[PDB]
Structure 1
Amino acid sequence: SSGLKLQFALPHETLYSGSEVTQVNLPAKSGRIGVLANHVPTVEQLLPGVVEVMEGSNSKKFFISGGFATVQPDSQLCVTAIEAFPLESFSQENIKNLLAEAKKNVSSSDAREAAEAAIQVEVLENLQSVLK
C-alpha cells in the first residue's frame, strides 16, 4: 500500500486507526525495527520501550507499556498497545523512583509476585530512561 498505516490503539481510547506514518520505531524483544512502507509480514512481541511515531509533522515519541508489533503483507502495521506516553507530560520522576524503591522490598516476596515485582522495577527503569 501507499506508505504505512498504523493501528496504534489503547483500551481507554485508540491512538491511531491507520494514520499514514513516515516511520515507526518498535522496541521489541530482539530489537527495534523500522517499518515505513511495504516491508514483509511479521509477528513480534513489543518490549516496553519508546515506540516513536516519526511523521512529517514531527517525530513524536511514545513509551509503550507492552504489546505486539505485527505486520501484514498489504503494508499493514497492527500495533496493539495498552498505555502510552503522551508527549512528555507522562514524565514523573519522583513517584517512579518511589515505587521502585518501595516495592523492590517485595521483589523477593513470593515466586510469581517477586518476578512481577522485578519486572515492574525493570519497566520503571525503562520509564526512567524515557524520563531523560
Structure 2
Amino acid sequence: KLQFALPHETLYSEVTQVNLPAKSGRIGVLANHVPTVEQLLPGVVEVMEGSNSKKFFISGGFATVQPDSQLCVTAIEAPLESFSENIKNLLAEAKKNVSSSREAAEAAIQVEVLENLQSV
C-alpha cells in the first residue's frame, strides 16, 4: 500500500505495483518488496493500483518500503500530464546562464531537469 504524500497533496494513502526511479537506477515494488530506503531522483513514475495505472511526474523525494509494507513516498510535487515546450525555452536560457555563473550548480540542475523533461 502506497502512501504518496506531498506538502499540499497526497494522492495515495492496495497499490499493487509501483515503478520508481531512484539513485540506484529503477526499482519496482510488487506486493511485499524488500523493506528499504531509497532516495528518489527526479522522475517519471508509474503507480499501478490493480491493473489501473497512473502516471506521475515526480520532483524527487524519497521512497521507503516500511517493514509493515507501507511504501512511503514523499515528494515535493506531482501527474505526468502536468509536464506538457515553454520549459524547453526556459532550459535554453538556463544553458546560457551557466556560462556566466549557486547559479552554476542551479544551471547544472537545470540540465538535469532538461533530461527529466525529455523523459516526458
**TM-score bin, normalised by smaller chain:** 0.7 to 0.9
Cα distance in 2 between the residues matched to 1:56 and 1:107: 48
* Alignment deviations for residues 30-67 of structure 1 (CA, whole Å, 9 cap, x no partner): 11111121222101100111121123352211121010
Separation in 1, partners of 2:48, 2:19: 8
CA–CA distance in structure 1, aligned partners of residues 17 and 69 of structure 2: 12
Alignment partners' CA distance in 1, 2:3 and 2:46: 14
Q: How big is the alpha-carbon RMSD for the aligned residues of Structure 1 and Structure 2?
A: 2.0
Q: CA deviation at 1:119?
A: 1.1
Pair 1:68–1:89, CA change in 2 (3 A): closer
Deviation at 1:120, TM superposition (A): 2.1
Q: CA deviation at 1:8?
A: 0.5
Q: Tell me whether 31-40 or 65-74 shows the greater mean CA deviation.
A: 31-40
Structure 2-normalised TM-score?
Answer: 0.85
**Aligned-partner Cα distance in 2 for 1:116–1:82:** 17
Among all aligned residue pairs of Structure 1 and Structure 2, give the percentage whose two residues are the same amino acid: 100
CA distance in 1, matches of 2:114, 2:20: 18
Q: Is the 8 A contact 2:42 2:60 kept in 1?
A: yes
- The number of aligned residues is 120
Rounded to whole Å, the distance in 2 between the matches of 1:121 and 1:45 is: 20
Aligned to 1:14, the other structure's residue is in SS state: coil
User: After the TM superposition, which segments of 4 or more aligned residues of structure 1 sit over 6 Å from their partners?
Assistant: none
TM-score by length of 1: 0.78
Distance in 1 between the 2:69 and 2:14 partners?
11
Residues 65, 40 of structure 1: alpha-carbon distance in 2 compared, 3 angstrom cutoff: same
Unaligned runs of 5+ in 2: none
| Alpha-carbon distance in 1 for matches of 2:105, 2:94 | 15
Q: Could you give the per-residue CA deviations for residues 46-97 of structure 1, whole angstroms, max 9, x where no partner exists?
A: 011112112335221112101011111111110001111x241431x22333
- Do structure 1's residue 128 and structure 2's residue 118 form an aligned pair? yes
Cα pair distance change 1:107/1:34, threshold 3 Å: farther
- Structure 1 residues 45 and 72, CA, compared in 2 at 3 Å: closer, same or farther? same
